[PDB]
Design a protein around this nucleic acid. Structure first.
Ligand SMILES: [Cl-]
Ligand SMILES: [Cl-]
Ligand SMILES: [Mn+2]
Ligand SMILES: [Mn+2]
Ligand SMILES: [Mn+2]
Ligand SMILES: [Mn+2]
Ligand SMILES: [Mn+2]
Ligand SMILES: [Mn+2]
Lengths: 103, 95, 78, 97, 93, 105, 97, 83
DNA sequence: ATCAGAATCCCGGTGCCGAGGCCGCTCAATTGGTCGTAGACAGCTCTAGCACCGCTTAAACGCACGTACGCGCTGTCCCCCGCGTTTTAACCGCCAAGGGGATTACTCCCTAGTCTCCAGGCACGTGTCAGATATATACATCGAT
DNA sequence: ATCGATGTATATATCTGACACGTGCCTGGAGACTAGGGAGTAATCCCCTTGGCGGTTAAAACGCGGGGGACAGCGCGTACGTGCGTTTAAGCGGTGCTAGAGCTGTCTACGACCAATTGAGCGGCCTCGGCACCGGGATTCTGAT
């Protein structure tokens, strides 16, 4: 393969196919499906990281959408990135505005 | 019974790489797949304009790179580029 | 039919919204608001169906509509 | 006995932000969706995922909206949200004119 | 070197519509952007439509439905009629 | 006539719109009616705007459309204004609108 | 002598600056600022004079759009005077960070 | 030569003039500094992006087009300068 | 009520330089003909969606009752507006220098494209446990006192 | 704070459907290998960007005095939250029926690719008339008396 040759888990072939057929440019370099597959791989790790963390924190061995949302919205950098994405079955973070609290 | 593709299995392999003793649900799996396609388009699309803007016909790792630097927050980009430049050189080792 | 969007349901959403106290006219306001939202999303959605020459609006039309409108949604085939 | 007005309110907030379940029951919603669409095109069918997608998109949106609404209420030294907040919220979002 | 521009067409149409009226360097420039913006906006959204429907080619059907997504009503409607008129006309000649 | 524009009975250069659509990576291939359509839609809109700008110019007593005139044009038309709801026109200025509660009673 | 009452010249100036389109920030201070910020990203950068002018055009539009929506926030809290907290609400709602 | 404190070039009258085109009549004193803060987060975005385009186009000169592309990126499309 | 001056609104003259025009040069579109594959259409297939039916059961509802919040009024205190004088540096149009963009010019490397061979990734298969479900207990409250 | 008292969390027993893992076919990827054109790189000119200086003054700064708004206090009236019992249709589990979407194989209409041919459209140059700038005068209205 090339996932191997690049130490990647993410399909370096698939990616090269998609770049070419998905109408981004006339021609497509050899480094790019590798560079990109890696960045996709990097980021899917960062999410799986903190979501997993979250599933531990929230006492479950399996990640459901919530654990993603929790991971994402609690991360300052990831929440930005997905600043315009509604994640199905995510709920919201718990935040109860000060002056609403009892005295 | 049509053969529609996804990233499902690689997500897992990466899941094992980070959280070996942990699992996932179908409902979250689509989210991880949706996530991947979305990120793919945004980077690819940025890359695409980059080429055009520069009167050039090829999307290289360099395009893909700067695209990342416009699409990602300071720290998240930082690592991405790292992991990106790494996987590339490592691949150009082998042949 | 629209008024089938029950007051209690709207109450629940505002609670998940962080909202503590609710005026009476909110409920109706919520409704026009929600209507406007779906219309726009379904107008775009259907257009995709009409262009796919289908009598059945899919998830992907919806998903595509939300993207168009800057309200991207995950978990229905991204 | 009796709970002091606005204290189950706080309790319900806690409950719903902890849960991820949908809050408008599926069928009134489903019938609302079909109504609105028939206005655009006749003799149509919806994928059950098509309706769920819509529902997720709509709720999440409204919640987001109540959040931002509730902040205008608070901005006006109030504690009750009012149609006039929603209007300012959407005005500033640039949704409404 | 050649810098291509919609400056002549924009003029043409202005002279068609307000025959004793000039346009400034900046205004032209602005206009010039507007055309390019709407071009990409349409073009891109048509491009998505081909793609979404596993399809290799952008035909005026695409460009049309692109228009129906992009533009507000009275604008869209007129634009559509306007456009499908020129197709028809173009076929015949 | 030679010009595809003339076959189409149009001002916009259908050849240019065809070149760009191809050197633009929107699809493998391009129909032949798609440029026509698009060139015509582009025409509709530049017309629709130049109509309102020139009127805007006329009231401000002017022979020549300057951006304020395009701006006035755009934000007074509910629809154009929405199409350009995210667009700064250089030298556009803003519409004269003063909130009520700031006016003397 | 003579003295215009408070808020009288404000209203005048509003009408002044709403008639015109010329930039409100001074040209030179602006440039100096932009060079600074850019230097602190990458040294040894030059600017097309029109590129400064682009950023300025874009900057003012934004802040004037901003004041617009800030001003609505003041008027929401039954005030007439704009305040940092107003600005802040507008940016939370715009979804700026 | 070294460049320091330039944000204070955004004098208080100007930050005022903008607010007037903005339809504001009464300006609280604590506004001026906030506006400067905001303008900064603003330019730090358009130029972080403009500059990237400039780095990518392998240039030592930032062009009107790198700016215009940046704005478009951040959904603040600007007409009047190319594009 | 009436009066003054300050600002804006408008007037003509005025001097300048940009838009608009004409002229000639070249590059991007036109023309025409081939060739190959996308898409369209027709013919069959089975999957997803719609429909109607009825049981217990939560959720919707409707009213009741009182409380605490919204809102309108008042008064105080103070900050932010206006103005005038002092102060500072923007703007203008003066020239002078060379870094850098943009245009040019040649060779060759990297990628698109064709083919043939090979397993990585997918539908689909089951048995299995993580976890939805809860009933009784453990706790961490809230309101009354 | 201290009461008893909710309603909430935590628990540990059992039940069941989606997970995760394996079966094996297949279609997308990969290795071989030709072909050329995009773009790298090195050479050359020619814009425009920076820099730097004083003549000029419009804009900024700074202080001063008080007008009128921020906001704090309050005081009334009611529009919501709470919560019992009172009314509906949401949902679930079950089967029935087909429109429509999915897949498959064929033919030709249409669009890329290519070459030779030329005025549409561009820059380069030229001129004067729209309009920006200066300066005078009448119209308005705001605030002082
Ligand atoms: Cl590459
Ligand atoms: Cl076509
Ligand atoms: Mn610095
Ligand atoms: Mn009087
Ligand atoms: Mn040099
Ligand atoms: Mn106590
Ligand atoms: Mn080249
Ligand atoms: Mn059928």
């Amino acid at each position: 393969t090339r996932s191997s040759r690049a130490g990647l888990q993410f399909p370096v072939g698939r990616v090269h196919r998609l770049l070419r057929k998905g109408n981004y440019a006339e021609r497509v370099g050899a480094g790019a499906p590798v560079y990109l597959a890696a960045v996709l791989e990097y980021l899917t790790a960062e999410i799986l990281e903190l979501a997993g963390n979250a599933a531990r924190d929230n006492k479950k061995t399996r990640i459901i959408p919530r654990h993603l949302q929790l991971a994402v919205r609690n991360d300052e950098e990831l929440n930005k990135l997905l600043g315009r994405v509604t994640i199905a079955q995510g709920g919201v973070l718990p935040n109860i505005q000060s002056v609403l609290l009892p005295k | 019974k049509t053969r529609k593709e996804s990233y499902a299995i690689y997500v897992y392999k990466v899941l094992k790489q980070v959280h070996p003793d942990t699992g996932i649900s179908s409902k979250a799996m689509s989210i991880m797949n949706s996530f991947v396609n979305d990120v793919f388009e945004r980077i690819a699309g940025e890359a695409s304009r980059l080429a055009h803007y520069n009167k050039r016909s090829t999307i290289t790792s360099r395009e893909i790179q700067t695209a990342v630097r416009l699409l990602l927050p300071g720290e998240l980009a930082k690592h991405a580029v790292s992991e990106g430049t790494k996987a590339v050189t490592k691949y150009t080792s082998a042949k | 039919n629209i008024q089938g969007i029950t007051k209690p349901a709207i109450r629940r959403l505002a609670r998940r919204g962080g909202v503590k106290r609710i005026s009476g006219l909110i409920y109706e306001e919520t409704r026009g608001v929600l209507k406007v939202f779906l219309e726009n999303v379904i107008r775009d959605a259907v257009t995709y169906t009409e262009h796919a020459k289908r009598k059945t609006v899919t998830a992907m039309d919806v998903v595509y509509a939300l993207k168009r409108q800057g309200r991207t949604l995950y978990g229905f085939g991204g | 006995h009796r709970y002091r007005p606005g204290t189950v309110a706080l309790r319900e907030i806690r409950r719903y932000q902890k849960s991820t379940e949908l809050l408008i029951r599926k069928l009134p919603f489903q019938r609302l969706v079909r109504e609105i669409a028939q206005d655009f095109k006749t003799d149509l069918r919806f994928q059950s995922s098509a309706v769920m997608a819509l529902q997720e998109a709509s709720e999440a949106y409204l919640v987001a909206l109540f959040e931002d609404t509730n902040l205008c209420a608070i901005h006006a030294k109030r504690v009750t949200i009012m149609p006039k907040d929603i209007q300012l919220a959407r005005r500033i979002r640039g949704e409404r004119a």
